[PDB]
Design a protein around this ligand. Structure first.
Ligand code: HEA
Ligand SMILES: [Cu+2]
Ligand SMILES: [Cu+2]
Lengths: 62, 50, 83, 201, 115, 83, 70, 100, 122, 70, 70, 57, 129, 115, 55
């Protein structure tokens, strides 16, 4: 089957999760229980855009 | 000499020295020996060892 | 450096791709930190002109050193061929 | 009878899709979220997560990783050559002589299974990953051994011992034990370290 | 003493009271079943024979043994002329089989290992 | 038997947090001394409060081994005497 | 004695992690190609600490697995 | 110990070459632990509940005499030293083949 | 572990049951002690069951004795019930006594393993 | 596949627990016993994380435009 | 091991060198940046060698059996 | 996948325990090793508690 | 070092190393049935050792000045009885301890007891003797 | 001499003497067993070697006892050390002995030292 | 039952009153709480790494 497509789906899910986790880590405060959901969503979108821009340069076969 | 037996009560009898030490199991028989002369002596078991 | 052929050709290619993806994720995080895109005072999900310029500079720097650094590391390690 | 209502939840993945600290996994854009030079993949490749333990997973997957080799065969380090420094080679051999640093694949698999079961029970508590058979453990220790001796009860964690007094009359110094402070040490504290360890004869 | 060995037929004891697979127990091949093969007591390098009879001469005709009410001890006694009149020769091999004289000596008299 | 202060949950204090304002125990918590009546007739008047005292103790000292043993023994003895 | 390639890979990964931690802690990168005396001392101390930590973590994982089994 | 049907093929994903999480089955043709080398197989069939011993139906199994006439799962498990004796006695499966 | 002395309260039946249950499943229970407990629990039931059966059998004959056969209903019922109760008591007492004695022996063995007995020092 | 989905969920759970504990500072050299206050803080952080994840899923499920190719 | 391990180590070293060069200074690439990366690579190699030596020694120093010495 | 998850958990625990413990980067002792083990145990317990709470608790 | 030693000296060094490293070998075999107890912390051991050292330093004047082994043994026995009661309480708390928090609490209690009341007892004993 | 031979010198066989010497040596050893490799002659720093506190006790015990009895007592003492059972941790026999003038409360006042 | 339980409960109530008077809101020294309120014992206890003593 489309093993490339499946690996791409897995990698994209992992990248989105990592971006969300990084945004949460940056935007969390007060030892947890203090974070903004809208700001987290905006940061996740911005990180998704940044990682999409970076994807062509780094993730490739050498 | 701490005389002792491993299996059954044996007896070391030096006839020239006139000594007879009965090494028995468990009994650590501390017996003195003073040979007032230099010599070589032979002996056998004074207890029937089997 | 006791190296042998454990992973197959396809395994090596997939592992290289995965390593590249992970390095790219780490580089994206570092670039965001350097370009202040991860500021907690962010008002939107967009990057201004200055942030875009910083991202472009970071991308150019990453491109300008990836292959060279990889080749230099390979030569410095001087990993013997497996046979 | 013990299985009348012992297993009610079975689709743990159905629970995984509910309580996982993650976004929904049905995002179709996730299939084509980004673009990469994927190349050719004729077989399924599983994404190895984490920057550190990713390749290690592949290490557990490849069969050749379980190939034993002599210390002569492993005669180099990623940045150093162990052939030159005999001391470094001996240190590496000692590091490889520890069982924890050279555990086998069967033990690795058993540890992985136990860790997976513990993670499932401590997180979901589905009671399905738990073992089916009940195991009764017996300490079949034969007391007829003059080389191995068990400890009835156990060693008390701390004990206070008074050092013997008047045992030595060599220099008429009845105080035998004197600490580094120089004061006569009359009492000493003996602490037990390992509860399960035996005692050398 | 080879005849005295009752453990030789101990396997048939398992099938004596367990008849479920008894026929299976009878499906094996006989190696010493109802047979006593004595190892050679002498060296005979005559390649004409693959094996040589080491069975007792007096026990050759089992028919003659079917009427005499005596055990196999007849064949074991005084059937060889070998003698070694040496003081160093061992004739007892039972150092535990002795007596403790008029005065029974302990523990030498009161223990199986010694007495 | 000893419950460590780090591991001792003040459930009894929780019961103290739930009692009403007019609680004699609260007055006892305030320092109201309670004395067993030493007057014969008065002691007779004290003979009818055993069950109420047991209920109060069970409310205050549910986890106490002595309280549990006393309650169980009293219930069993009541059953046996009634039978 | 013989060792497995999987063990070699695990040791290499542990060494890489320890080296990264030591570099990040002692700031080994802020040098002109030669580590200072303090840099080398900190590298040795951090390497010993990281080796002890790897041994302790491996022992902890093995003990958790055993307690699960036992 | 004869083979009734050929075994199943190896799974494509190398992640399946390990002992199953619940079934404990390791579909690895080359198991690193030869003591853990297992050759699995797949068998499809219908389930037939345990038969009842009935003298009227001429089902008298002289187990001590080795004569069998009823499907006694308990006796079968006792003979075979089966671990899941109760589960085996619960029910049985009559092997089926896709015709012919 | 239990108190030693005449003034000490005798062991309860529930206490004996709990002790047997602990000995049957304790992680600190040795293999030989577990084997002794299983062996005791095996044979003990047969004695009580056989006692009950023997009571049911013998008491049946007493209901047809030459004199008991011509008594009133209540008297005959009492006479017949007399042997069965005695034999049931015999069987139950024998089973329970064997179980409790072997349980006490196993508990002593465990205490020897646990070293919880004062003045028991090698 | 169920295996990949569960792996992703477990990885996300591990990452969230690690982030919460780093926020909760549940690691101390004084003792290994997690205090009741520490458990309460961890529970608060976990509830916040779960609510944030639920809100993010609700926002993403309602509109797919928030996540688009590149 | 396999060359993929060396590739992973190289990727980690490249990320570390990028952090050391452009972690806080995001500027244009140049021969100065290349030389800084080369110096960082040399320092990383030296640090890895020192860490390996110290870790192997400490792990080799920890007793595991009675000293026989033939 | 189970081995990968276990390795990831172990790596995260090791990272957290080394960050917390090797904060002064001074030489370790028996007490320091005990503190590291305590930190690892605390991390495992916190992970278990957090996972249980996330699993509708 | 070992290479700097002759055959006899090398054998002696090996003897010392092996005799000192016995426990490591003894670290191998363990009995499952034993009730495992969390070991006392090294910091707690050090604090208890410091308290014992303070007690020994206090005892040092009277112990050195005394010329009677009987008197020394009597003082030691009284102090041992008191400290043994305290240590018995501490060990009873330690054996049933379920966490490092309980271990630390028990250790702190034992150290404070040695620090506070044992000092008064020793002072009274010294003033008497 | 620490355990005088005159304690049981009336007897010809030193059985009770060997027993008492072994008990005393075991008590001393158990008192100082753990610090032998850290503070005694079993130390690594050969210039810091201090004679073991049970040196004379062990020598006297070996002199009094024989080889087989010493081995058996050593096995028994190994069992005792495994138990870690101090003689003071099980002693109750002091209650059931007749009072003696040597057991007065003020033991120091018992001795009458004169020059 | 009144005599027996009255003596017992009089002692118990005197104890309770004394405890309340000192504002002692703690449970009895021999109080056994439920299983859900019991702190479980940590099982993992790794022995320290062996090292030859310099002395
Ligand atoms: C009463 C007892 C008695 C008698 C009569 C004898 C008689 C003889 N005994 Fe001895 N002997 C013992 C009692 C006796 N013995 C005992 C108890 C021992 C020790 C066992 C041990 O060591 O444990 C011993 C041991 C003993 C040994 C030890 C062997 C060894 O230790 O190496 C030897 C060997 O020289 C020996 C020799 C003889 C000889 C040569 C005679 C000759 O005198 C034999 C002559 C014959 C007789 C003396 C009998 C007389 C004959 C008659 C028929 C009388 C009837 C007549 C009338 C009607 C009045 N005897
Ligand atoms: Cu002899
Ligand atoms: Cu003889």
């Amino acid at each position: 089957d489309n093993y490339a497509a499946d690996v791409q789906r897995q990698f994209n899910r992992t990248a989105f999760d990592s971006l969300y986790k990084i945004c949460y880590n940056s935007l969390v405060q007060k030892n947890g229980s203090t974070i903004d959901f809208q700001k987290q969503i905006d940061c996740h979108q911005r990180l998704i855009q940044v990682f999409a821009k970076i994807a062509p340069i780094v993730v490739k076969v050498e | 000499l701490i005389t002792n037996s491993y299996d059954i009560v044996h007896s070391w009898f030096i006839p020239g020295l006139g000594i007879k030490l009965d090494c028995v199991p468990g009994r650590s028989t501390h017996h003195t020996f003073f040979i007032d002369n230099v010599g070589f002596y032979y002996g056998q078991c004074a207890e029937i060892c089997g | 450096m006791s190296t042998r052929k454990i992973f197959d050709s396809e395994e090596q290619s997939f592992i290289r791709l995965v390593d590249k993806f992970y390095l790219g994720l780490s580089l994206t995080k570092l670039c965001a930190q350097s370009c202040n895109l991860l500021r907690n005072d962010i008002s939107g999900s967009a990057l201004t002109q200055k942030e875009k310029d910083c991202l472009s500079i970071c991308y150019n720097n990453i491109e300008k050193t990836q292959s060279a650094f990889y080749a230099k590391v390979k030569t410095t390690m001087n990993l013997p061929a497996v046979e | 009878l013990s299985l009348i209502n012992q297993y009610k939840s079975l689709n743990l993945s159905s629970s995984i899709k509910h309580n996982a600290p993650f976004i929904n996994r049905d995002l179709y854009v996730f299939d084509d979220l980004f673009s990469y030079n994927l190349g050719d993949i004729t077989t399924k490749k599983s994404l190895f997560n984490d920057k550190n333990s990713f390749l290690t997973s592949y290490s557990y997957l490849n069969n050749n990783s379980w190939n034993n080799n002599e210390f002569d065969l492993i005669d180099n380090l990623p940045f150093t050559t162990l052939f030159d420094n005999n001391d470094l080679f001996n240190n590496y051999k000692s590091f490889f002589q520890d069982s924890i640093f050279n555990s086998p694949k069967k033990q690795l698999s058993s540890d992985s299974k136990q860790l997976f079961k513990h993670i499932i029970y401590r997180s979901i508590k589905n009671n399905i990953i738990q073992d089916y058979t009940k195991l009764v453990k017996h300490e079949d220790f034969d007391e007829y051994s003059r080389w191995i001796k068990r400890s009835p009860g156990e060693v008390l964690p701390l004990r206070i011992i008074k050092y013997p007094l008047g045992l030595e009359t060599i220099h008429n110094n009845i105080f035998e034990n004197t600490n580094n402070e120089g004061n006569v040490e009359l009492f000493r504290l003996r602490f037990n370290s390992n509860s399960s360890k035996m005692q050398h004869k | 003493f080879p005849f005295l060995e009752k453990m030789k037929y101990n396997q048939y004891k398992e099938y004596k009271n367990d008849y479920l697979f008894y026929l299976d127990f009878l499906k094996k091949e006989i190696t010493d079943d109802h047979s006593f093969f004595w190892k050679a007591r002498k060296v005979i390098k005559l390649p004409q024979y693959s094996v040589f009879s080491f069975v007792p001469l007096k026990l050759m005709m089992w028919k003659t043994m079917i009427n005499y009410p005596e055990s196999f001890w007849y064949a074991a006694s005084r059937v060889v002329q070998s003698r070694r009149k040496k003081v160093f020769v061992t004739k007892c091999s039972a150092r535990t089989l002795t007596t403790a004289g008029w005065t029974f000596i302990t523990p030498f008299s009161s223990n199986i290992k010694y007495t | 038997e000893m419950i460590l202060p780090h591991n001792n949950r003040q459930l009894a204090r929780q019961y103290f947090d739930s009692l009403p304002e007019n609680d004699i125990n609260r007055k006892y918590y305030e320092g109201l001394k309670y004395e067993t009546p030493k007057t014969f007739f008065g002691r007779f008047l004290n003979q009818f409060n055993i069950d109420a005292k047991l209920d109060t103790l069970s409310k205050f000292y549910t986890y106490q081994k002595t309280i549990r043993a006393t309650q169980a023994e009293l219930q069993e003895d009541r059953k046996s005497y009634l039978t | 004695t013989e060792v497995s390639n999987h063990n070699y890979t695990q040791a290499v990964a542990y060494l890489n992690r320890a080296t990264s931690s030591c570099v990040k802690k002692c700031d080994s990168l802020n040098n002109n190609g030669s580590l200072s005396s303090k840099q080398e001392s900190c590298l040795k101390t951090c390497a010993e600490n990281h080796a002890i930590a790897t041994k302790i973590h491996a022992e902890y994982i093995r003990k958790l697995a055993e307690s699960k089994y036992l | 110990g004869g083979e009734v049907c050929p075994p199943m093929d190896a799974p494509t994903d190398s992640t399946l070459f390990v002992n199953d999480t619940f079934t404990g089955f390791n579909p690895d043709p080359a198991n690193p632990e030869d003591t853990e080398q297992v050759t699995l197989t797949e068998i499809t069939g219908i389930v037939r509940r345990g038969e009842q011993q009935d003298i009227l139906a001429r089902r008298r199994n002289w187990n001590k005499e080795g004569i069998y006439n009823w499907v006694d799962l308990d006796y079968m498990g006792k003979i075979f030293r089966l671990f899941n004796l109760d589960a085996i006695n619960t029910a049985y499966i009559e092997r089926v083949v896709p015709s012919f | 572990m239990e108190p030693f002395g005449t003034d000490e309260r005798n062991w309860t039946h529930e206490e004996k049951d709990i002790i047997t249950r602990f000995l049957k499943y304790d992680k600190h229970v040795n293999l030989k002690t577990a084997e002794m407990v299983y062996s005791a629990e095996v044979e003990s039931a047969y004695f009580g069951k056989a006692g009950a059966l023997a009571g049911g059998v013998i008491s049946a004959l007493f209901f047809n004795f030459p004199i008991v056969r011509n008594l009133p209903i209540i008297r005959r019922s009492v006479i017949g019930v007399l042997p069965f109760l005695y034999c049931y008591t015999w069987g139950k007492n024998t089973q329970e006594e064997l179980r409790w004695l072997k349980t006490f022996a196993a508990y002593q063995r465990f205490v020897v393993y646990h070293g919880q007995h004062c003045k028991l020092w090698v | 596949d169920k295996r990949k989905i569960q792996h992703e969920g477990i990885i996300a759970l591990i990452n969230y627990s690690t982030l919460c504990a780093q926020k909760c500072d549940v690691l101390k050299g004084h003792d290994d016993k997690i205090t009741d206050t520490e458990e309460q803080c961890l529970r608060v952080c976990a509830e916040k994380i779960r609510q944030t994840f639920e809100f993010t899923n609700d926002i993403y499920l309602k509109n797919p435009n928030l996540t688009k190719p590149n | 091991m396999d060359p993929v391990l060396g590739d992973v180590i190289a990727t980690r070293i490249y990320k570390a060198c990028f952090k050391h060069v452009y972690g806080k200074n995001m500027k244009a690439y140049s021969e100065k940046d290349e030389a800084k990366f080369d110096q960082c690579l040399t320092s990383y190699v030296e640090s890895y060698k020192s860490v390996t030596n110290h870790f192997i020694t400490y792990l080799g120093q920890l007793p595991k059996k009675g000293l026989s010495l033939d | 996948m189970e081995q990968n998850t276990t390795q990831v958990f172990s790596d995260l625990a090791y990272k957290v325990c080394f960050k917390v413990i090797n904060d002064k980067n001074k030489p370790f002792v028996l007490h320091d090793e005990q503190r590291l083990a305590n930190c690892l145990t605390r991390y495992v317990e916190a992970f278990n508690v957090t996972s249980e709470y996330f699993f509708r608790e | 070092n070992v290479e700097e030693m002759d055959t006899i000296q090398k054998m002696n060094y090996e003897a010392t190393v092996n005799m000192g490293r016995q426990d490591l070998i003894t670290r191998e075999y363990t009995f499952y049935s034993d009730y495992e107890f969390i070991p006392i912390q090294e910091d707690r051991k050090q604090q208890m050792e410091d308290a014992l050292n303070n007690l020994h330093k206090i005892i040092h004047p009277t112990v050195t000045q005394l010329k009677k082994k009987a008197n020394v043994q009597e003082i030691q026995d009284r102090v041992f009885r008191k400290l043994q009661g305290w240590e018995g309480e501490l060990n009873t708390c330690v054996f049933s301890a379920k966490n490092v928090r309980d271990s630390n609490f028990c250790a702190d209690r034992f150290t404070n007891r040695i620090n506070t009341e044992g000092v008064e007892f020793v002072k009274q004993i010294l003033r008497e003797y | 001499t620490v355990v005088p031979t005159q304690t049981f010198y009336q007897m010809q066989d030193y059985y009770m003497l060997c027993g008492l010497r072994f008990e005393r040596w075991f008590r001393c050893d158990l008192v100082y067993h753990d610090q032998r490799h850290t503070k005694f002659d079993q130390v690594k720093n050969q210039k810091n070697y201090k004679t073991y506190p049970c040196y004379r006790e062990y020598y006297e015990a070996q002199y009094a006892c024989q080889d087989d009895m010493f081995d058996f007592l050593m096995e028994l003492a190994y069992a005792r050390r495994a138990a870690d059972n101090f003689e003071s941790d099980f002693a109750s026999h002091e209650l059931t002995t007749l009072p003696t003038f040597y057991d007065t409360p003020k033991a120091a006042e018992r001795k009458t030292y004169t020059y | 039952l009144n005599q027996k339980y009255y003596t017992h409960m009089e002692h118990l109530w005197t104890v309770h009153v004394n405890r309340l008077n000192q504002k002692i809101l703690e449970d009895p020294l021999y109080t056994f709480y439920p299983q859900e309120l019991n702190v479980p014992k940590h099982n993992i206890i790794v022995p320290t790494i062996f090292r030859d003593t310099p002395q």
